[PDB]
Amino acid sequence: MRVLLIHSDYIEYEVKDKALKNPEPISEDMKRGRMEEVLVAFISVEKVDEKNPEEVSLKAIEEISKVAEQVKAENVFVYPFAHLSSELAKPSVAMDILNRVYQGLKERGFNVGKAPFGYYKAFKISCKGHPLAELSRTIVPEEARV
Amino acid sequence: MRVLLIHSDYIEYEVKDKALKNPEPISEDMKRGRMEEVLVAFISVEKVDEKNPEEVSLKAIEEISKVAEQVKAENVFVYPFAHLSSELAKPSVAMDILNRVYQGLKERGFNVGKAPFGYYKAFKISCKGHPLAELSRTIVPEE
Ligand SMILES: NCC(=O)N[C@H]1[C@@H](O)[C@H](n2cnc3c(N)ncnc32)O[C@@H]1CO
Ligand SMILES: NCC(=O)N[C@H]1[C@@H](O)[C@H](n2cnc3c(N)ncnc32)O[C@@H]1CO
Numbered sequence: 001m002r003v004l005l006i007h008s009d010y011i012e013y014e015v016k017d018k019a020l021k022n023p024e025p026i027s028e029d030m031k032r033g034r035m036e037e038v039l040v041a042f043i044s045v046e047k048v049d050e051k052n053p054e055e056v057s058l059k060a061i062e063e064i065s066k067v068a069e070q071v072k073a074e075n076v077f078v079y080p081f082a083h084l085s086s087e088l089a090k091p092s093v094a095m096d097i098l099n100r101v102y103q104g105l106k107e108r109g110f111n112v113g114k115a116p117f118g119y120y121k122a123f124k125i126s127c128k129g130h131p132l133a134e135l136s137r138t139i140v141p142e143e144a145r146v
Numbered sequence: 147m148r149v150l151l152i153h154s155d156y157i158e159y160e161v162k163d164k165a166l167k168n169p170e171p172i173s174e175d176m177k178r179g180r181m182e183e184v185l186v187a188f189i190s191v192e193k194v195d196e197k198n199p200e201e202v203s204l205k206a207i208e209e210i211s212k213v214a215e216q217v218k219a220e221n222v223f224v225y226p227f228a229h230l231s232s233e234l235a236k237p238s239v240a241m242d243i244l245n246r247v248y249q250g251l252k253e254r255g256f257n258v259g260k261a262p263f264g265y266y267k268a269f270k271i272s273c274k275g276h277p278l279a280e281l282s283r284t285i286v287p288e289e
Contacts, residue, residue, distance in 0.1 A: 129268025
């Protein structure tokens, strides 16, 4: 898994075309979204991750929760972004993992938004440009699931 | 070299704190920028790249031009972004490659802009949400 964390003034998106044969079904309310004061997590689920979806999910939750706490962000936004890596996991695995991360972060008490998986989106972001405003992590499973 | 290409309505930046001991010397004018209708090229120069700075520059220039032509962008903005990779080049090498990338795209007739190197920067970008508007590439020498 590759994660790119952008501490932002806002994040907005507009659902445009479908980018997969199997996109996440979406409601009308999900076509557009916007969130202010927000740790935006751009995430590519990698092929390596398919080995243990739960381990990398847990690890992504912990890691992102920590950057949010040291930048004082109460809002986090999970943003599917296949473009952060070259050895990409299969959509279905990626969709699963992005949800566990998302739900994982909600369970921690944060205010979490998400953009729909499987679509091209217009997006706006405004990076704060602090030392801690731009961070990346590579998170891989250390051992296969049971 | 990792390259992330974002066809945007605009790109806008503001230099904040220095992120290296020796950041690229810049003018006051260079402290803020903006460019519109722009292919934005976020680039991380990687350690592997040090083996052939000219070869990697060349295929980066060619690759970025190709997308710029597909996307119909006349404006290209070169945006140094270390966080596209964890396996980075040394700053001196990173700047050499970025300079070549800049001048190579300037050579070809694009309206080319850059952000200052060695700094933390606040930035704004609006991605057009088109199929071709987000593209990434790994570009690595083969001596
Ligand atoms: N809006 C820019 C975009 O990235 N669109 C992506 C993601 O929404 C999603 N996607 C597919 N595979 C993956 C993956 N392995 N990891 C993360 N997302 C994925 O499917 C789209 C087409 O690849
Ligand atoms: N956006 C904010 C930022 O990334 N700031 C980075 C880059 O401008 C630059 N930098 C250093 N090394 C590299 C490299 N190998 N490739 C690209 N840029 C580099 O130095 C800053 C601190 O690492």
